[PDB]
């Protein structure tokens, strides 16, 4: 159904060394398709996804310019900020930026955002209406004002509504056969020799995609949602991820406890 194309470009300060390492990256539904990297022998926006080879040099050039340009912006900028934060030129920094548009299966845009951050803690962000500015601290509100003068909200909002959605609609078409693959998870349970004369049922799900997955331990319809310490959905390797669940259960009575795995790619939810 609906989708999202977002870009997460960062800048790391290397004052003494010689130049910040502005690195950009691009995603279409949690899937990375382009990355730049201002430290490479040849700065080039190389295709990650396979479906991005079919574009051409016409499009691979038009990009690397936008790249080096923002490089300047992340440079020029980053510096003004040690002035704002009255920090002596030496402490490494990180100016970050993220943007994109979320489109409903229907076709029209649903929401778009832009956000900057300087060393983690938020610095400023456009609001939902695409017109307001949520500046973080005093040194950041300085910017909120200045941007309302040139009309940051009408410039960026412009890119959001049309173009971001426009190109998005292009990407999906080009990589349709790949992007919409929904790999279903594989069932697996486990019990361990824990010293308390207890057992540990481990509900193992592997090779799945997308990652948004629901997973719990049961006991008669009602779900043992409290004792099941589970993991943080982590990247297996090839492309399909994995997740696991835990419930400490003494012998004999074990057979009663169960696991359940919910995921967008199953015809009937799984009960193990």
């Amino acid at each position: 159904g609906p989708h999202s194309m977002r870009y997460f470009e960062t800048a790391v300060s290397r004052p003494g060394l010689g130049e910040p390492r502005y690195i950009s990256v691009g995603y279409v539904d949690n899937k990375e398709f382009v990355r730049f990297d201002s430290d490479a022998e040849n700065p080039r926006y190389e295709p990650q996804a396979p479906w991005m080879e079919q574009e051409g040099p016409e499009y691979w050039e038009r990009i690397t310019q936008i790249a080096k340009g923002q490089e300047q912006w992340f440079r020029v900028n980053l510096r003004t900020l040690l002035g704002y934060y009255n920090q002596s030129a030496g402490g490494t920094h990180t100016l970050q930026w993220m943007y994109g548009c979320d489109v409903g299966s229907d076709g029209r845009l649903l929401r778009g955002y832009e956000q900057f951050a300087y060393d983690g803690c938020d610095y400023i962000a456009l609001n939902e209406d695409l017109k307001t500015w949520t500046a973080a601290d005093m040194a950041a509100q300085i910017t909120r004002r200045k941007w309302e003068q040139a009309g940051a909200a009408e410039y960026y909002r412009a890119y959001l509504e049309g173009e971001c959605v426009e190109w998005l609609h292009r990407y999906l078409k080009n990589g349709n056969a790949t992007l919409l693959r929904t790999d279903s998870p594989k069932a697996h349970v486990t019990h361990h020799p824990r010293s308390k004369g207890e057992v540990t049922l481990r509900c193992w799900a592997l090779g799945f995609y997308p990652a948004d997955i629901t997973l719990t331990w049961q006991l008669n319809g009602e779900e043992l949602t409290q004792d099941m310490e589970l993991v943080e959905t982590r990247p297996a390797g090839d492309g399909t991820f994995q997740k696991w669940a835990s419930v400490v259960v003494p012998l004999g009575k074990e057979q009663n406890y169960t696991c359940r795995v919910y995921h967008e790619g199953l015809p009937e939810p799984l009960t193990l």
Binding site: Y7, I66, Y155
Partner: peptide
């Protein structure tokens, strides 16, 4: 399609 940024932060 990365967009350009004029307005210096």
């Amino acid at each position: 399609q990365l967009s350009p940024f004029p307005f210096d932060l």
